[PDB]
Symmetry: C7
Amino acid sequence: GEIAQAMKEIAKAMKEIAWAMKEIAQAMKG
Amino acid sequence: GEIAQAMKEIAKAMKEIAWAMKEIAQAMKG
Amino acid sequence: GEIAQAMKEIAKAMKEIAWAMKEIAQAMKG
Amino acid sequence: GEIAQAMKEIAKAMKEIAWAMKEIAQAMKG
Amino acid sequence: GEIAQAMKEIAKAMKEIAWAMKEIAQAMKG
Amino acid sequence: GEIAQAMKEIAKAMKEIAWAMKEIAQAMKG
Amino acid sequence: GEIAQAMKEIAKAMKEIAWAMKEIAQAMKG
């Protein structure tokens, strides 16, 4: 449905944004 | 469909933000 | 209504943020 | 009500974040 | 209630993020 | 309940993101 | 349920994004 599917897509995108931010943090850590 | 339409646009926008953050992470990773 | 109006304004903002993140990613892409 | 007021504040902040992100994209655009 | 409190805290935090993004945009403008 | 817990965790995280983004803005401010 | 599981995944991702943003803020301060 309209609400459940939109929430599942938000969750998948948020997990990918977290993975990318962790890579950027690791590049800038010494 | 004001709530359904907002949630669909938020979900698509978050998928595009996730693609872009993965590209930036890939540019910055060793 | 104030909740439908806020959801609509959040969706339009998220679309603008996605456009901006794509421009930045394109600038940084090798 | 507090839930309606919180949503309206989140919408106003998201609009400001969209404006800033477009300025940053304009500075890095080629 | 815990849900109304969570939404109030989300709103205050997004207002602070919008302030910080405007500062970063002013630094990079030009 | 798990939905109330999720909202509390999202609020705590948004406060930490807002704190971090103000430190980044301070570093970038002349 | 899919909506409860999406909310739990959004909270875990937001907590990881908060950790990453504080590591980046640490890199950028004395």
